[PDB]
Design an enzyme around this catalytic site. Sequence first.
Site, PDB file in Angstrom:
ATOM      1  N   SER A 145      35.168  11.951  21.219  1.00 33.68           N
ATOM      2  CA  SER A 145      34.579  11.073  22.238  1.00 33.68           C
ATOM      3  C   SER A 145      33.100  10.866  21.925  1.00 33.68           C
ATOM      4  O   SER A 145      32.792  10.354  20.834  1.00 33.68           O
ATOM      5  CB  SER A 145      34.941  11.568  23.642  1.00 33.68           C
ATOM      6  OG  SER A 145      34.794  10.532  24.599  1.00 33.68           O
ATOM      7  N   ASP A 244      42.676   3.093  23.446  1.00 35.63           N
ATOM      8  CA  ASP A 244      41.919   4.254  23.898  1.00 35.63           C
ATOM      9  C   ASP A 244      41.523   4.119  25.366  1.00 35.63           C
ATOM     10  O   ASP A 244      41.086   3.056  25.816  1.00 35.63           O
ATOM     11  CB  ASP A 244      40.680   4.416  23.016  1.00 35.63           C
ATOM     12  CG  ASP A 244      39.833   5.605  23.405  1.00 35.63           C
ATOM     13  OD1 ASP A 244      40.032   6.695  22.828  1.00 35.63           O
ATOM     14  OD2 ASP A 244      38.944   5.440  24.263  1.00 35.63           O
ATOM     15  N   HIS A 293      43.373   9.579  25.004  1.00 36.73           N
ATOM     16  CA  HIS A 293      41.963   9.799  24.685  1.00 36.73           C
ATOM     17  C   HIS A 293      41.740  11.204  24.138  1.00 36.73           C
ATOM     18  O   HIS A 293      42.196  12.185  24.733  1.00 36.73           O
ATOM     19  CB  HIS A 293      41.063   9.561  25.902  1.00 36.73           C
ATOM     20  CG  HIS A 293      39.603   9.563  25.572  1.00 36.73           C
ATOM     21  ND1 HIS A 293      39.062   8.729  24.618  1.00 36.73           N
ATOM     22  CD2 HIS A 293      38.574  10.300  26.054  1.00 36.73           C
ATOM     23  CE1 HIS A 293      37.761   8.947  24.531  1.00 36.73           C
ATOM     24  NE2 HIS A 293      37.440   9.895  25.392  1.00 36.73           N
TER      25      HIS A 293
END
Length: 349
Positions: A145, A244, A293
């Site tokens: 991330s 995503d 994610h």
Amino acid sequence: DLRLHLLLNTSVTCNDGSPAGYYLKESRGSRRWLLFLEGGWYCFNRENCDSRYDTMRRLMSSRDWPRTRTGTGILSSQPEENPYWWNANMVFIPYCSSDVWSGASSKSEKNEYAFMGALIIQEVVRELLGRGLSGAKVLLLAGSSAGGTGVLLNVDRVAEQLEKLGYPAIQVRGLADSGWFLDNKQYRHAPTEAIRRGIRYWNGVVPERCRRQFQEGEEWNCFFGYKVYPTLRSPVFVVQWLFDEAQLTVDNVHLTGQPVQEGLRLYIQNLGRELRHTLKDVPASFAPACLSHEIIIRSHWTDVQVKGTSLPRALHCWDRSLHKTPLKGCPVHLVDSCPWPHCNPSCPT
Ligand SMILES: OCc1ccc(-n2cnc3ccccc32)cc1
Ligand SMILES: OCc1ccc(-n2cnc3ccccc32)cc1
Ligand SMILES: OCc1ccc(-n2cnc3ccccc32)cc1
Ligand SMILES: *[C@@H]1O[C@H](CO)[C@@H](O)[C@H](O)[C@H]1NC(C)=O
């Protein structure tokens, strides 16, 4: 378990001035070192940073960190959980700078908070060199991330730092998980302004070759993988879900209610095609057609496959390629071509 070490240079700090640090598990028999960058969004002004301090304080302070952490996924030392690098030296760097790992500003009379993410990475590397990193053959800088974007922003800086410090034989490489975003139009109503804001609030820094292309005021462009990747010199493997959840969040898309009508169907299909296109000249990549994610530090990260090949296999193939011609039965470029979430049966449930 990985054991906490607070930085000996206490001027390199989390947001509130407490010392930054790292968690370490040594493997004396190995010359491979894996340094992982945690994620967790960011903040970009006094008021939303104050909010983050009240309910996400572990991302702004060392203050309440535990003595140990368990390594999971790619950070696991167990071959059943980590087929790729189970015997490596493991390092987890907590994200306590709220700056997508880009900042180089201290607390001061002018600044309520310190944003030192780029310097935290520098200092962890410097202090590890006295703890065995000086003998490394490969340093893999990984992250998820905001940490994945942080890999793209910092991998060449680490390579330059080691060259300058007198360690030319350490091969620096990057693994960017869930940090490859598109500056596309939103599905409903600008999101790039927050990056914009943040860089100025943090004194954020981007890789020099990318900065030279986009020039003053336009450094926000280098937070987007498809723009910064061509300027990097270190080898980088890119992991990105085609659909995503963070990308869809900032696009104002909420795939929860049952019926999806034509406009949203076309939007979702175009997003996957555009992501596919940005990866077409990225030779080391893993991009499954799933709505999800993050991928690399979860315990079941081995389950997902593209064209029959798992991510731990793809990473092993990438190692072999870096000993040019492709390898028989051991591929490194793995991007799904089917056009809808979970058209790949191996997507996380
Ligand atoms: O899950 C809800 C949700 C909504 C929006 C966001 N978000 C969008 N842009 C951001 C920039 C900084 C921090 C959070 C941000 C996150 C989470
Ligand atoms: O963690 C700090 C923090 C900052 C911003 C937010 N945030 C919430 N809704 C948003 C919409 C757009 C941009 C940012 C947004 C959440 C959290
Ligand atoms: O236009 C779509 C859109 C997608 C992502 C973002 N975005 C927001 N904060 C970010 C931090 C790093 C990379 C991308 C980021 C903005 C806009
Ligand atoms: C601690 O780190 C800061 C920031 O990089 C640097 O200015 C300073 O030289 C370091 N202190 C020592 C004693 O090395």
